[PDB]
Amino acid sequence: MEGILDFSNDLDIALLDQVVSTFYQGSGVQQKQAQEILTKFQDNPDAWQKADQILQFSTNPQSKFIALSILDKLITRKWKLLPNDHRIGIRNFVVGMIISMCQDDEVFKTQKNLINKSDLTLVQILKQEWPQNWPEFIPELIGSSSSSVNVCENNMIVLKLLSEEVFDFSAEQMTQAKALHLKNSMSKEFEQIFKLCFQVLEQGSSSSLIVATLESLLRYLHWIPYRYIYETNILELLSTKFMTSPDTRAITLKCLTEVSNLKIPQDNDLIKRQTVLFFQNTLQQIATSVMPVTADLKATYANANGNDQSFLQDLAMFLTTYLARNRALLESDESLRELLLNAHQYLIQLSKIEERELFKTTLDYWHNLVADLFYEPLKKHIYEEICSQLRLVIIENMVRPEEVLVVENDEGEIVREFVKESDTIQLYKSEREVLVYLTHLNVIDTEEIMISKLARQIDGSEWSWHNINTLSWAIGSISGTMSEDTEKRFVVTVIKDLLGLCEQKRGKDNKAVVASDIMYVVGQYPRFLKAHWNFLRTVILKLFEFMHETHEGVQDMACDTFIKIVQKCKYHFVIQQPRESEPFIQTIIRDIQKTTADLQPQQVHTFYKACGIIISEERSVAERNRLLSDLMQLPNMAWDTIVEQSTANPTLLLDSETVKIIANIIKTNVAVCTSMGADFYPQLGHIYYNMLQLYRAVSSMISAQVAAEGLIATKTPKVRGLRTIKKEILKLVETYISKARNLDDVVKVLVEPLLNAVLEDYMNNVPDARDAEVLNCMTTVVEKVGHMIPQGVILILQSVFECTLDMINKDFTEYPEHRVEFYKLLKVINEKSFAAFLELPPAAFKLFVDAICWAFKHNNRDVEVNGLQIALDLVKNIERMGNVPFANEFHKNYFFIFVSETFFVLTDSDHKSGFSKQALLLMKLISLVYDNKISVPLYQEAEVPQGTSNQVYLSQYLANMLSNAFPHLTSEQIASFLSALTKQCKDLVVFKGTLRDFLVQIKEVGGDPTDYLFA
Amino acid sequence: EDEEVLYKVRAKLFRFDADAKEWKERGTGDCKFLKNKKTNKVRILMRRDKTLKICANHIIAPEYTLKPNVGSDRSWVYACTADIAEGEAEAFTFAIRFGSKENADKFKEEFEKAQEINKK
Amino acid sequence: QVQFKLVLVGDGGTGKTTFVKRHLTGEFEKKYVATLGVEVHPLVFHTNRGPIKFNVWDTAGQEKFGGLRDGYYIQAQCAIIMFDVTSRVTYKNVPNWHRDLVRVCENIPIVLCGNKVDIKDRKVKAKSIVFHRKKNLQYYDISAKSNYNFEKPFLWLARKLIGDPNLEFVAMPAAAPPELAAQYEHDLEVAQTTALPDEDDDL
């Protein structure tokens, strides 16, 4: 099998044809070795010399396909490099073998893959040679089309692929100058291409030639002038004749869709009429040749015969595309009314299909419509009946909202969701928007539908979990659209009815469904709840009952419902209501232990967070602080008992139950702090010093355990628990500082005990014991108070900078959090307190510049962006220093390091996603020398002549760099590129373009240096 | 329908790759203890969720011992000499993680009940 | 059991190999070892209509490791195009992969998959993903890590290839199971003292 690699001997074709057969038609270990042999055969630079041998003599179509792949690579990369007799010779056996295969009816039928590849491989030659070295291609292609039907059909495939390669996929793969050259060449000779295309459409009716001709037509519609479509009969042919045969229908519907999407010269009544007419015809053919408007398109798509699903997909795409753009043409004229409503009745029927991605396509249209009907005068009455059906369609297909935490499992029981359904969140939002708009357009109709559905749920004649769920989610979704008085009675009826179902329906399962729907509804209607206190009180007490429920979904949803209600209704908890001896927040806090007794720790923390939201509504500082104190009674008593014990020891923390008690105390403090923000200061102050003492104590035990048991200790439960305590203490401080209003007390009271506790600890621990959350905590400290503590920023750098950089500079994989949080911290320092980097000794500042270019080289999106942003901001920072010693020594040491490293990531293919920021950075660097913002010389005193400008040396450096980095470029290619690149350094869109031209030319040999004179 | 379900619990199963020196997930789903009414012999049967492919199918042998993993308080590690999930009877070092310590402890308890039933 | 050639294409690091391995063995590979050319892997599902086998041609997304490129798509009866929802450039290149795919495979069922939805910082939003509509591709948000919709691309392809949209995955009945030593307790030791990955996961 490996004898085909050796080209010192002649290539054995019969051997090649078996290693290919082994690869495609074989399996196992024989297949794997055969693929390696084929990839090495392909990747050999002299393999193209064997391609004509293969195309003539080979018996296997896949061998021939791979022969053309080798040519494809030769033509796109090393074409220019070849002798002209090889280029003209390669053209001959490709053109000669395409026509060979089209004369043989059996080869034309059975080997379509090989023919399509030969056609694509020809188009690659045309890109290189046409029309400058092949002016007669298009007139000779038209001349050949008259002789044979196979040749005519295949020419439509060549013209299709040529249109793709020039107009659809040229932006990335060609220079701007060559894409424009090819577009103009086709644009110049399209007159006679269309003449052929159109006469073929009139003379075939339905066949493979007609399909191929319509396939190429689809591509032409992406770019050709509007006159070709509208000043020819072709719209009649598409909208009538080609709709009737199913062979042409799919591709015609796609053509018409592309046509439909165009914007019309609205001054012209003739094009308007022609735009009405092709729609009128298309709809007529669908009604007569496919299915009527009444047809059950849901059952059809679900049965999935032939191309029925693709067809209905394409119809939806055609109807929505046309009607979004052109429905106003059908809306005034009374004779066009039936056409408008039929087209919308097809969408109503398409919208009933069970297929989410199709439903989204239709829903996007309905949104476009109902949005327009909301704002456009005199439109909604036209679609009253369409809208009335759409309310019913949407109510019946509401997806489970995020808040509803119960589902039916595959067994058939009502169970807590295992995970969040991330993909249905956008779908729900989309449904709510449309359903909200429809409710606004006729509030009476929507109420009647929902109430009559809800009546049939009660009597049992339409009861199920799907029906009651979708109803309730829709009822919830439309909160906001009714009046206060209408909502009042509407909500009362819905609740009172859902409570009726509660009573009648028995079992663990039924009760959980109805409760989850009651919860969803109640939480969606805060305005009702605010105006009706007795009810609000009852709700909240019922939610507290559900916190003791043995069903976990119900329990977990009651907590989320509670928090959700209080975010909106908090004010009604802080005041003293009529008929109440006190604010309800007092009552809640009082029974907090009893209420949250059956909850898991994270749910208890939500409950405390909710109490926090309420408490922050109290504006009297004396009373807010008192409420804060009462709320934190349980965790403070737990905390005070822990410090008395930790004073005696501190080895009692080893007990993992103590670790858990501690962690949950901090987590509760974090949770109340997230809702209270700046108002949390009094509770933080109560525990702060004992907490940072516990941080040290906990940090001792971590280090002690690492020494005692090894690095494996960091994976154990007890250490991970101890590490949690540290992470949560840092989270609490990060959270407080991030929301604090009084920044003076942050700097004076909090910052200096914090830094002492965490920095030296971070620095002196082994890599695997260092919490990345230290870095994150410091990012926030510098962000909010960095300007206020410049000496404290220096202390942060000294502790975390070099030891963290050493963790992350071996490879790109290890310590991923530290990596990410490290560059965030450096970013905010460079913005807010740049002075800290000036105090770094020279060798450490070198490590800082090395750290930034290391960030560039990351594939990791988070690191890469921050890397490029620091580089940008560092240059601005050094620029604004002006002409001083540190700026001069910066530019002499690090300017060309940034230029060359920015150039490496542009040009190496593996950092494509940072192209915009790389281009901007490089522009800013080049700008400096063309504005003379670098005052000193960038060169050694005797490297170039005396007093040579930095502009001259910069071009000379880059010429040399690129010449060595890309030795296949010519001196002229480089010289041209840089000339262009430099004088476009105040024009980013063109600068970027000139870079992309460079990126194209480096993938090939012999690129045209005039290409860079494009703007 | 041949087997009584003695104990069912949601779990994640791992197998130890000795050569790579790391754990690899084998499946996530319901780990059932199935009591054969003909032979009175309990096995672990575990299927992956959605695909329903068998990730564990072996007897709860008397010889086996559940040992802790150094990194987890809600897992057990044990040596299994004959699992027939992926066809032919292979030997494995499984670990199995659960949603909580409580579940892991009840698993251990029930695994040993099963061992006493298989011992008779 | 008839067998269908599936080609799997998409940008580098989008999670194609991770996805396939997950279905083959159940594992989650955390390392990114770039595929060289292609790895063919047989992969069987059991349905109510019998076993369906895919020959999964797991192609290389990086250009330099591309190999035969479009030559891998010949005689493929279905395909999955993959991208990463945490990077735009992988969604931006979906049309290029599709374009190369449909030139060879003119009429086959194709799935578009948005991998890595389990990551919090999502870059390619749900509303952005619309390329599949005109090209008649099925779309699923997936995560090889969390197993979110991991079965869907195969369930859908199986329905189209067999030609029955009520086809479901089913559980095959399991046979009753049966009723070196110096390295097995060495494995059992190093296994107990090697920590199980992702101990913060819910399972």
Ligand SMILES: Nc1nc2c(ncn2[C@@H]2O[C@H](COP(=O)(O)OP(=O)(O)OP(=O)(O)O)[C@@H](O)[C@H]2O)c(=O)[nH]1
């Ligand atoms: N968070 C997350 N990471 C994933 C997921 N799927 C894969 N990955 C990770 O992303 C990387 C993807 O690696 P591969 O699956 O080898 O990528 P590929 O698509 O095969 O890339 P090529 O081999 O170059 O074509 C691995 O490091 C995986 O751990 C996912 O669903 N979620």
Ligand SMILES: */C(S)=N/CC/C=C/[S@@](=O)c1cc(C(F)(F)F)cc(C(F)(F)F)c1
């Ligand atoms: C029937 S569904 N029984 C089990 C659950 C009971 C629900 S009713 O008691 C209920 C639930 C709620 C909710 F969800 F907490 F908001 C409120 C109310 C009430 F009517 F507001 F009290 C009743």
Ligand SMILES: [Cl-]
């Ligand atoms: Cl030159």
Ligand SMILES: [Mg+2]
């Ligand atoms: Mg791969």
